[PDB]
């Protein structure tokens, strides 16, 4: 038993059927967007129908929104002639052809690698337009080539999500150390931090082991441990967006010429960060308010394209200050059946 997702035009008979709503990638290869279209024989000369896969990228900041400019670009646009008035098919496409009928025209897209995943920036209450981020869309045009204008009635628009999952290899656990020499003679202060693991799932607790060796003439006042999320925007040379999604301040003090080891638990979640405008979250379809953006994996030997999301645990000690950063990956694992891509309890 298998089921597909169908999108129908407001007018006429133009129905697009897609097997799955998520098209994941394995760095080396990307799952192809395979689907079918049913179009009624309502045309006389316009016997050409096109399918366009567009990886649109939009961005807007608070200062830019106030000024009145919002960046927009098309990272990758692929056009395929669905109707052949070569191109191997799949078992799902063959089953769709058999069930739908002879009019079922297939279309297959092979998404090239080194493309950003579907990540949408969280919009504030003021923003009411298109979602800011990278969105993958499939648009069906029943018109004579691309010369004619795009018609809302004829075109079928369906939002698809390209996401990555946690790698099979967990990777070495982060372990970051920093020794600082104070201006008062040669008095070294040592800080070290370690994580339970390198790959982290959304909602899972994060355990950080922090050890401080004070050989100075000052006492540490407070320790701030935060989970910074960084959103590198390669296009338009936009400045890096850094946002603390979780924080913990400890008033404990460490005496000079003494050692102190402790463990801290930080669990990032969206409820506390719901008011952070511009935060990068997972791909959205109809404003479902998905989880935090899964940290993209740059396994390629590394291209400046789209939005690159990363997470780092930052530990800061005051009395200047000593700051250390431990990168970690906050990515969803491979789901058993499929990602629902929506709030499972609708109400």
């Amino acid at each position, epitope marked *: 038993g298998t089921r597909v997702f169908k999108k129908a035009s407001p007018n006429g008979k133009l129905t697009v059927y897609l097997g799955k709503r998520d098209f994941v990638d394995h760095i080396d290869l990307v799952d192809p967007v395979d689907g079918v279209v049913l179009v009624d024989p309502e045309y006389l000369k316009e016997r050409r129908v096109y399918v366009t896969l567009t990886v649109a990228f939009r961005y807007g900041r608070e200062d830019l929104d106030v000024l009145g400019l919002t960046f927009r670009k098309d990272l990758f646009v692929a056009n395929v002639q669905s109707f052949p008035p070569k191109k191997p098919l799949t078992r799902l496409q063959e089953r769709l052809i058999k069930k739908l009928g002879e009019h079922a025209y297939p279309f297959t897209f092979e998404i090239p690698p080194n493309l950003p995943s579907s990540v949408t920036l969280q919009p504030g209450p003021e923003d009411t337009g298109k979602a800011l981020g990278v969105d993958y869309e499939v648009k069906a045009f029943v018109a004579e080539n691309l010369e004619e204008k795009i018609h809302k009635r004829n075109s079928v628009r369906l939002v698809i999500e390209k996401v990555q999952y946690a790698p099979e290899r967990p990777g070495p656990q982060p372990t970051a150390e920093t020794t600082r020499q104070f201006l008062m003679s040669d008095k070294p202060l040592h800080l070290e931090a370690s994580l339970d693991k390198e790959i982290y799932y959304h909602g*899972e607790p994060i355990s950080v082991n922090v050890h401080v060796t004070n050989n100075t003439n000052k006492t540490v006042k407070k320790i701030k441990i935060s989970v910074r999320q960084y959103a590198d925007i390669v296009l338009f040379n936009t400045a890096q967006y850094k946002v603390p999604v979780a924080m913990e301040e400890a008033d404990d003090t460490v005496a000079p010429s003494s050692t102190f080891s402790k463990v801290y638990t930080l*669990t990032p*979640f969206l*409820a506390n960060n719901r008011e952070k405008r511009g935060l990068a979250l997972d791909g959205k379809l109809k404003h479902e308010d998905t*989880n935090l953006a899964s940290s993209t994996l740059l396994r390629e030997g590394r291209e400046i394209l789209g939005i690159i999301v990363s997470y780092k645990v930052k530990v800061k000690l005051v009395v200047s200050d000593v700051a250390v950063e431990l990168p970690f990956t906050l990515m969803h694992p491979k789901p058993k059946e499929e990602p629902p891509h929506r709030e499972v309890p609708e109400n």
Partner: single-chain antibody
Amino acid sequence: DIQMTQSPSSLSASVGDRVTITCRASQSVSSAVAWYQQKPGKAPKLLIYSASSLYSGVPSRFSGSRSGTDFTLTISSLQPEDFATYYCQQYKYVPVTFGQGTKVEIQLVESGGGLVQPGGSLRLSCAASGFNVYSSSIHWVRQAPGKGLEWVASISSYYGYTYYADSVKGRFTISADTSKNTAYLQMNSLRAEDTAVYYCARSRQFWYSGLDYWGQGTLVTV
């Protein structure tokens, strides 16, 4: 709300036979229908989740199918230990009330039970082990004698969402102590309207792979 109809009301078959149970929904549910089972004196256990996808930890004899709105649960062989009460649940929409419940015939810890005054406040404590409140959604479901399970409360700490049934709205408060990694349920009510045993179950936080783990529960008598 969406009401689920479960048939047959009572079923009896020989050991090793094939038993088919039908579940009809009020409207379309987008195949977000699960099948649970419970034994007398025992907490319910999930059997089938997410449109006939078998859950880990249960025998492969159980199978599911979906024909439009109708859902079918098929048991190829009726094992001697496979004599339990089956329920059909839909979690596509809130409320997530279960089905009528069919009968077949030939970690989480809950506390806070005991004698209850006719009108007053009750507190139920749910100790959770092996998982975090931000990595799962905590639900509280009551079961009254002579009737099946009924969804009552749901809390999702990751999204900060809370949901209550219409019959319990305005009087039920559910909280998740992340530091203590536990759940608290406060119910200020009157009479014996909520004289039922309460189970503290959990579901996957994001994809909601059914109510896999169910609490033992404690008896509440008004």
